[PDB]
Design a protein around this ligand. Sequence first.
Ligand SMILES: Nc1ncnc2c1ncn2[C@@H]1O[C@H](COP(=O)(O)OP(=O)(O)OP(=O)(O)O)[C@@H](O)[C@H]1O
Ligand SMILES: Nc1ncnc2c1ncn2[C@@H]1O[C@H](COP(=O)(O)OP(=O)(O)OP(=O)(O)O)[C@@H](O)[C@H]1O
Ligand SMILES: [Ca+2]
Ligand SMILES: [Ca+2]
Ligand SMILES: [Ca+2]
Lengths: 216, 216
Amino acid sequence: KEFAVIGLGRFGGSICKALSEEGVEVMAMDIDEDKVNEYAKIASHAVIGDSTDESVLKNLGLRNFDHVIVAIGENIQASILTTLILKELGVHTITVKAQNDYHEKVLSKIGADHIVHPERDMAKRIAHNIVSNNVLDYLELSEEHSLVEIVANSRLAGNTLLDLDIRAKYGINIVAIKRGKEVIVSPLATEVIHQEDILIVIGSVTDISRFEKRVL
Amino acid sequence: KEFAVIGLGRFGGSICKALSEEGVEVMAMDIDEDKVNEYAKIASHAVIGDSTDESVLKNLGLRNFDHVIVAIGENIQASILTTLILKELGVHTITVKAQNDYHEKVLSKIGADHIVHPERDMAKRIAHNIVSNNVLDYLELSEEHSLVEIVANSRLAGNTLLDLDIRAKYGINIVAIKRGKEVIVSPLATEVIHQEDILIVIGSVTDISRFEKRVL
Ligand SMILES: Nc1ncnc2c1ncn2[C@@H]1O[C@H](COP(=O)(O)OP(=O)(O)OP(=O)(O)O)[C@@H](O)[C@H]1O
Ligand SMILES: Nc1ncnc2c1ncn2[C@@H]1O[C@H](COP(=O)(O)OP(=O)(O)OP(=O)(O)O)[C@@H](O)[C@H]1O
Ligand SMILES: [Ca+2]
Ligand SMILES: [Ca+2]
Ligand SMILES: [Ca+2]
């Protein structure tokens, strides 16, 4: 498989490092020579170039590449134009970092396959933690369902899962518990909740909200 | 509770918007007046100022604030100095966006409570997906354990969980299945895996790796 990353900022450079650490080859490109130099021994092919020169991406051989990541940030126009060119070159999968909603909307119509929002998505998790302290983190599983990490409080602590009856009363499922350094997976109803346990829970976002209100 | 965000880039501004959307008050600060203007109706108090002026943060009343987020990016020195000042002001919880390892190392010793890497953390998830296609995403639960989203292949499809015997053979647990738009939570052993099911799995990173090798 052939991988390329265009734009070596914190996202693009981290993609380059992660791919390198996974043990695969990656072409890493940036218009800034100093950035390219930083990745000269990390990427298998580090390239100084402007990705908005059509012949440049073609001459580099990006036609039919398996996956190209566009991580140009503040230059929304360069990002969009680069994406356009990659699509015309038949790149199978194009992932692009979006700067805003406008950027995303355009990227979607010109055929980016995956549009990602690293800063925004982490900000949302952090803000949710901030405003509800017992909720440590969450991961959306579908439009309706999420996984949520919940710190047990005094009300939960000391009771068996059987007695808590959370599935029947709240519609949500405790699928694991982090207890100290250990993770208890698929705990039985006989499991007793300890103070400072982190409950790993799956349910609808609606049911989770009701649980937070009732219990947290 | 009192919240402040310092630096309104994509991360800081997204934190400001997310907090605003959660319905809480937030003070949003930036040295760039145009950025502050963008958040004047989103933040409950939008402030033009240099967070590295000690008297500025004190006069704004940040002493003993519940949570302050430092999202100054490229100015590592301003970030570090701002963090130092907030700590001296007794801020209960300081979360800081780190630009690199050096930045993180210094932030840790001068007492940032939470150091976050939005670009890097998303890059790692993406790169892992890229190099192992059946693996859609993952979330670390502990140093030893992770949650992983795995697309079922032809080998898994058509078999009951009972017959697959994945817990006994691989040490990992299927705690949910995304099937179309639905999530099946805590499936029973009688559940049959469908093509294109997304298995939500929890196990040790070691056991997960062995499973990927054997089955994916
Ligand atoms: N036309 C182009 N061709 C190749 N690289 C480019 C082009 N335009 C910009 N870049 C590179 O893209 C990289 C990332 O751009 P920038 O730093 O503005 O994005 P960012 O959103 O701050 O990135 P991150 O959030 O990942 O740090 C920069 O190193 C820049 O040199
Ligand atoms: N001393 C300071 N006081 C207040 N705000 C500052 C200070 N220095 C920088 N900022 C603001 O911090 C914001 C973010 O900085 P910058 O854009 O360099 O970070 P970034 O890593 O690109 O952010 P993001 O990744 O969140 O887009 C900018 O709006 C900038 O004006
Ligand atoms: Ca444009
Ligand atoms: Ca960024
Ligand atoms: Ca420094």
